[PDB]
Amino acid sequence: FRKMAFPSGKVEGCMVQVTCGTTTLNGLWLDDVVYCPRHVICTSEDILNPNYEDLLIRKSNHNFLVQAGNVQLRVIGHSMQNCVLKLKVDTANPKTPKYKFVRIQPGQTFSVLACYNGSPSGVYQCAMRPNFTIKGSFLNGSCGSVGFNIDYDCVSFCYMHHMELPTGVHAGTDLEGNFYGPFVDRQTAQAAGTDTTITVNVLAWLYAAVINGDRWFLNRFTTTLNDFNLVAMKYNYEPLTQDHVDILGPLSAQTGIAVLDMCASLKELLQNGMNGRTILGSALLEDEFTPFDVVRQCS
Amino acid sequence: FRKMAFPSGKVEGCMVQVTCGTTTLNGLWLDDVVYCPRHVICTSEDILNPNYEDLLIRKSNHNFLVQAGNVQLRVIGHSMQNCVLKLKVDTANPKTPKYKFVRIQPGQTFSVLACYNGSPSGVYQCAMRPNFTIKGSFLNGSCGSVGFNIDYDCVSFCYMHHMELPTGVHAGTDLEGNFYGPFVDRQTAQAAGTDTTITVNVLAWLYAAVINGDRWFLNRFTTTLNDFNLVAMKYNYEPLTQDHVDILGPLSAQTGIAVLDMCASLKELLQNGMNGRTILGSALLEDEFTPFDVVRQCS
């Protein structure tokens, strides 16, 4: 199995650059609105504890330089929604895809189009960790890069990049500017809470192994969801939700292995280890493939 | 630090679907020519042992059904270059990027845009293995998907997909239709030569681990180039040349670790194992990042 990003072309056509002062970051141009991180209006003196409301009252439309490549888009209105700035421009983007703004859950994956100065640089898959960070690859100038899923030509934007944490992982908002996790857009020392293993994704990976004929770990036990969740927490695994059980439905049907039976299999792996055996050619259990990713790659 | 693919938009606009008889696969539309694998002309019986020139002379232009999105393109001519068919169409692709056709070297990387029925499905990074296979993610109908690199807006196409070996690795051609490796577009179970590990890429990846603040594998020892190559060859690694040492220059200069010092690190890792530890989250030595890949991502 491979981490497979979505084709990025529909998002590439939406990337612009936004400069305020000497700060340039990326923005997302959909119809006649450009979305970008609000900290673009900050100066080096403002970043430690910015007063965003007061900083925005001092700004005008003519303070914002929005460029598609080197072509300026005239700004005709501006507002702030949570942690994102919305700049109304005088041109509707003709490359706007069908799209939706979505807030994802921990465990869900998405493609990131890493951008600099409005120019796309690369694309890769990320998983939202239970502590609401992602292991991205972002350098200076990457803020405003977005993460997305594509379903039948509709782009669901779920992530806009804002910051790096001391441990090297990353944090950001949805496209309504609401941070994932307990982070704030200040230049302050923030620490990711203790992370956990994404149980629903590990189960998806065990289903993927079974589909491919690797099923030594299928055992003779079952469990209740509550009994499993209590054991999972003792191994730093996430508890399963009702939604998790349901999204494992298609893989359970495809293999004929009930979800709670697979849970009992993983429970044995957690209490006894792998004993030098592998699963899908790996000694480690993979937790960044969702049940959709497994189906997507096997279809 | 992640495996990062190039943004795929410039290639997406080039993908079309090619149908001949009962066979459907993808084609690459540049200017007024569509490139696709020639085994599209084969039927279920032809494929075991096809005489392609004989099969192709018996085809007409109207035997080829080319679809770009919903619109039909009309084939007004056709020729064959090695294992690739060149279908001349009456419309120029308006989305043709600046492009070149290149034959890539073993150890080099490229991005694959996996397509089905002419529609892009996913994007991911691959390396050309020393045995001229690629470890990809390809299903039925993925033939004609292409691999590429992008440099300053110029797409360099290096790979077109043709088949999957029984081991699950993949084989294809350059855009001139010549296979990478000893493979042939016939429906037979084919084996590759023994694969080896791309040593220069393992070293680049160890340097990436240090740029990202990881050092558990470093040691105080050093080695000569020839002594390293003796151990490398013993573990089925490719030889390291002086040109490789030079190409690793920037990564050594950035981290202040001499190339031959890092070779002594890898020698130790090869002779001791990783001992249950991980490097950049991996439990195995990674050889699909080139020195350029590491540089581009890290700076």
Ligand SMILES: *[C@@H](O)[C@H](C[C@@H]1CCNC1=O)NC(=O)[C@H](CC(C)C)NC(=O)OCc1ccccc1
């Ligand atoms: C967006 O331009 C930038 C993304 C950082 C740059 C280095 N890697 C990243 O992901 N965001 C910030 O620099 C962000 C801005 C406000 C939230 C204050 N601040 C931040 O991430 O603090 C940590 C940091 C700053 C500069 C370099 C490295 C880490």
Ligand SMILES: *[C@H](O)[C@H](C[C@@H]1CCNC1=O)NC(=O)[C@H](CC(C)C)NC(=O)OCc1ccccc1
């Ligand atoms: C192209 O659409 C298709 C590629 C994929 C790769 C994954 N599974 C696929 O089907 N190519 C073929 O089907 C190819 C056709 C030949 C005429 C080149 N055949 C092939 O991959 O067969 C491999 C094979 C043949 C006999 C025994 C075992 C394997």
